[PDB]
Amino acid sequence: RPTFYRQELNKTIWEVPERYQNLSPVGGSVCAAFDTKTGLRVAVKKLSRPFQSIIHAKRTYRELRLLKHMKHENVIGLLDVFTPARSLEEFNDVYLVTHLMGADLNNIVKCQKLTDDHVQFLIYQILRGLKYIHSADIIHRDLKPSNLAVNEDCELKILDYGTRWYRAPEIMLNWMHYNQTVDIWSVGCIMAELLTGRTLFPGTDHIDQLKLILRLVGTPGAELLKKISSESARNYIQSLTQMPKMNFANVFIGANPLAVDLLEKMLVLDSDKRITAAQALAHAYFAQYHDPDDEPVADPYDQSFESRDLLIDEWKSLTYDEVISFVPPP
Numbered sequence: 636r637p638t639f640y641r642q643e644l645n646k647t648i649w650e651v652p653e654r655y656q657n658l659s660p661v662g663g664s665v666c667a668a669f670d671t672k673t674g675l676r677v678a679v680k681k682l683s684r685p686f687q688s689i690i691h692a693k694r695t696y697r698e699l700r701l702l703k704h705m706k707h708e709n710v711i712g713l714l715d716v717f718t719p720a721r722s723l724e725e726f727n728d729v730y731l732v733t734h735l736m737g738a739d740l741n742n743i744v745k746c747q748k749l750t751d752d753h754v755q756f757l758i759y760q761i762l763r764g765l766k767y768i769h770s771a772d773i774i775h776r777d778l779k780p781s782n783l784a785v786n787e788d789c790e791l792k793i794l795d796y797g798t799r800w801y802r803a804p805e806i807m808l809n810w811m812h813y814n815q816t817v818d819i820w821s822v823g824c825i826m827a828e829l830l831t832g833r834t835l836f837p838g839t840d841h842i843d844q845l846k847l848i849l850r851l852v853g854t855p856g857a858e859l860l861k862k863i864s865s866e867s868a869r870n871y872i873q874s875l876t877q878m879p880k881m882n883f884a885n886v887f888i889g890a891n892p893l894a895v896d897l898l899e900k901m902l903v904l905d906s907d908k909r910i911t912a913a914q915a916l917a918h919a920y921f922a923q924y925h926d927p928d929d930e931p932v933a934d935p936y937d938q939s940f941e942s943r944d945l946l947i948d949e950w951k952s953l954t955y956d957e958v959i960s961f962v963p964p965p
């Protein structure tokens with residue numbers, strides 16, 4: 636058991652092993668720290684008030700379980716988790732240590748005009764990671780430029796798994812449960828923006844957002860209208876005149892036609908037909924990066940705990956168990 640020291644930053648006290656030095660406020664709260672053990676810079680996150688409620692405590696537990704499970708070059712992972720508490724009874728603080736990422740994809744599309752090769756590399760990395768996330772049975776559900784860390788070498792990690800601008804339309808319809816392809820929709824929106832320097836669907840609210848989407852992909856085939864239980868949703872789609880399905884070729888003139896085709900296959904209104912991460916990784920557009928022997932899948936992931944109402948002390952105790960059972964990587 637390590638040596639802890641204490642420190643006031645911004646407004647909050649931090650008690651962390653001595654192994655971590657020069658804590659510097661970045662973003663729970665996030666300090667950047669020097670891992671004296673590895674020489675590497677890392678991020679130390681102090682969860683806010685981890686066991687403030689049933690909702691907070693289950694989330695804390697969920698966040699710990701997720702991060703413990705994620706072992707892939709393109710998905711945020713856990714370097715360490717600790718707590719100053721020395722018993723279950725003391726336990727009120729949780730810290731997570733991860734690679735210091737320092738820039739997001741927003742800081743990348745916003746202050747540049749990326750080339751085609753750059754978009755192949757970034758998107759390929761999203762999809763490689765997403766394949767691993769999906770093969771665990773996890774849907775991420777909030778993929779957007781700000782949940783993607785991109786280091787100075789253009790290496791990418793997916794952050795925060797399990798803005799309306801990237802949300803699959805079926806989510807905006809509420810829709811009684813949906814599938815992994817809700818993520819492929821997001822990816823298609825991210826790609827479009829990488830290529831164009833423009834937000835694809837900068838909807839003003841959830842209604843507008845549907846309009847903007849329809850402008851591009853066209854009003855649903857009767858075979859898709861057939862699947863919408865909601866009459867008011869039905870009505871609104873059939874209202875606002877039947878819209879002209881655009882040619883992606885014109886919306887994306889100048890883009891590599893391979894990029895354009897792939898977009899067409901991602902931004903399909905019917906999540907059934909939307910291309911999957913596994914598939915998209917084999918699309919020609921990625922021919923320079925693809926390698927089926929280096930696109931691993933995840934060990935299956937236990938999320939049965941999502942289907943239960945437990946007490947705070949129960950979520951707390953399970954979280955305590957996970958901290959203590961953490962085994963670090965190489």
Ligand SMILES: CCCCCCCCO[C@@H]1O[C@H](CO)[C@@H](O)[C@H](O)[C@H]1O
Binds near residue numbers: 805810845849872907
């Ligand atoms: C703007 C109008 C929105 C177009 C309809 C969204 C199509 C989403 O697709 C639908 O998603 C559902 C949720 O998984 C599935 O149950 C259906 O099989 C699938 O076709």
